[PDB]
Amino acid sequence: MRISPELKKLIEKYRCVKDTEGMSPAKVYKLVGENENLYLKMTDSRYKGTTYDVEREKDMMLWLEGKLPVPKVLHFERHDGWSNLLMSEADGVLCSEEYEDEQSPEKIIELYAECIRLFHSIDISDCPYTNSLDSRLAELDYLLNNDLADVDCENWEEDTPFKDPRELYDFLKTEKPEEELVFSHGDLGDSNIFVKDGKVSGFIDLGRSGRADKWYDIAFCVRSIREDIGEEQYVELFFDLLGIKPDWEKIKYYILLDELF
Amino acid sequence: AKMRISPELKKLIEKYRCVKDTEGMSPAKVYKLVGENENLYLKMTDSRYKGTTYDVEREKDMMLWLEGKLPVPKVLHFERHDGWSNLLMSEADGVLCSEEYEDEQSPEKIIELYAECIRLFHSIDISDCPYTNSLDSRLAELDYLLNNDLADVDCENWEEDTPFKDPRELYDFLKTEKPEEELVFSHGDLGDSNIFVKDGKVSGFIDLGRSGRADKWYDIAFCVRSIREDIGEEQYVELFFDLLGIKPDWEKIKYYILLDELF
Ligand SMILES: NCCNS(=O)(=O)c1ccc(Cl)c2ccncc12
Ligand SMILES: NCCNS(=O)(=O)c1ccc(Cl)c2ccncc12
Ligand SMILES: [Ca+2]
Ligand SMILES: [Ca+2]
């Protein structure tokens, strides 16, 4: 059945719609109700205790209550190997949508800068998870060995500098940079930030959130900017807003790290 | 070491730009390979699915058998590599049916196309068909999928208006109410995203892992389900059976639509 009798009873009066598998390997179901939407997010036991495990996402959502705008945890359970999280819908409009037609590079970059600022204001002394590079790399070793890592187009392309996934891993292992831990979203992108009245209104997709180096989220922003918006001058703009000098070695490193995840 | 595809295959596709497909064929992974003279498609399924109608090896076998019988993609390369089954194939010919009806307001042309498919399938000589997807076969495979939590458990098992407490009860029902069967060639997952059209006539089929011998009401039932949830009006269902020249056996139609839920 995958969900418990209790959870089924909770979600009964909602119309269930499978999401487009945007959060694969997690299964996401939109639950359309009369007065609101709920989201049910599920991950199987192969992902237990990794940064994909929604139990992990649930823990961070509870800890983040009162520190960052996040959906409310409504129900959580382990059932028949599955981790099942039922949550409220984020407030505001999804970034990718808010700026869908907005050819405004300036606004998403401004939004990225605000997120980084918000993150650095969060006290991580009691943060439930530490996603230091030793932890991420141990996890990556495990995913690789159990054929759960995300091997695809970026390992097969002729243009790849590494002959295979394990070559990229060894590089990540030996070139590990020094780290200064701060709160980190883990997968910061326009598909999981919500905005409302020009202000950040919510974050979702928090399974990879916790302590990590400050250049990790920054690196993701640089990658977003370059992928969408095409011009490198918007990268320089991003760093003027942050008011810091980019560390390209670290930025390159974190972008490579995400390839297998 | 953990490439998923062999060096031979990596090499074959080197000159192509790789792009992940919509993921509408889960649990298969599909990659569109954009080149200068054509596009290829790489479709991969993992070892949990070996032996089942999800395994692309079975789809490859059917595609080789169908060459010259139905318009289908060409098998460019197939391999087993590290538990994976990998199939490289050409692009279908024509326009995807759900895109020709994109905005044409031609509901009857969809109905005509479905009826054409059914007639085409009935004309296929299956004397040497590699697979027999009889109800015994499908139910044995469904048993295995449920035992390993590989069945498609989702909304349909969770809704308030579900007639079955759990997936097993559905299975025992399907096993108990097994209708009699008249085998003909069957696509196995006939739908608007699987049928290509060129010049008002069918021009290609994809998604063939579930194809082989099955009862004639199987594909017909999928058409009725498609017509109702895509078009809506019941007059197009009556038109469908009129074009087929047969009266609908609703007990069998409902049976096969039910069968597909866990898949
Ligand atoms: N990028 C998410 C697209 N759909 S969404 O924004 O409504 C959405 C998708 C998935 C989950 Cl788990 C959510 C949770 C809370 N709010 C919106 C959620
Ligand atoms: N619903 C399928 C639409 N995308 S498609 O028609 O281009 C397509 C998708 C997936 C595969 Cl494997 C294909 C193979 C051959 N031709 C088109 C193929
Ligand atoms: Ca990847
Ligand atoms: Ca189902």
Author numbering:
A (entry chain A): 4 to 264
B (entry chain B): 2 to 264
The authors write:
For aminoglycosides, a group of antibiotics used to treat serious nosocomial infections, the main mechanism of resistance is via the enzymatic inactivation of the drug by acetyltransferases, nucleotidyltransferases, or phosphotransferases. Among the three types of aminoglycoside-modifying enzymes, aminoglycoside phosphotransferases or kinases (APHs) yield the highest levels of resistance thereby providing a rationale for focusing inhibitor development for these specific resistance factors. Combined, these studies reveal that although members of the APH family share low similarities in sequence and their ligand specificity varies greatly, their overall three-dimensional fold is homologous to each other and to that of ePKs. To further examine the suitability of the CKI-7 scaffold for inhibitor development, we determined the crystal structures of APH(3′)-IIIa and APH(9)-Ia in complex with CKI-7.
Previously, details on the inhibition of APH(3′)-IIIa by CKI-7 have been reported (Ki = 66.1±7.5 µM). The APH(3′)-IIIa-CKI-7 inhibitor complex was crystallized in the space group P212121 with two inhibitor-bound enzyme molecules in the asymmetric unit, analogous to the nucleotide bound enzyme complexes. The structure has been refined to 2.15 Å with an Rcryst of 0.189 and Rfree of 0.235. In the nucleotide-bound enzyme structures, the loop is positioned above the phosphate moieties of the nucleotide, whereas, in the APH(3′)-IIIa-CKI-7 structure, the tip of the loop points back into the phosphate-binding area, delimiting the nucleotide-binding pocket, reminiscent of what is seen in the apo state of APH(3′)-IIIa. A principal contact between the isoquinoline or adenine ring with APH is the stacking interactions conferred by the aromatic ring side chain of Tyr42 in APH(3′)-IIIa and Phe50 in APH(9)-Ia. Consequently, an interaction analogous to that between N1 of the adenine and the linker amide is observed between N2 of the isoquinoline and the amide of Ala93 in APH(3′)-IIIa or Ile103 in APH(9)-Ia. In APH(3′)-IIIa, the aminoethyl-amide adopts an extended conformation and it is situated just beyond the ribose-binding area, toward the solvent exposed opening of the ATP-binding pocket. Two hydrogen bonds are observed between this section of the CKI-7 and the APH(3′)-IIIa. One of which is found between one of the oxygen atoms of the sulfonyl group (O2S) and the hydroxyl group of Tyr42. The second hydrogen bond is formed between the terminal nitrogen of the aminoethyl tail, N2′, and the main chain carbonyl of Ser194.
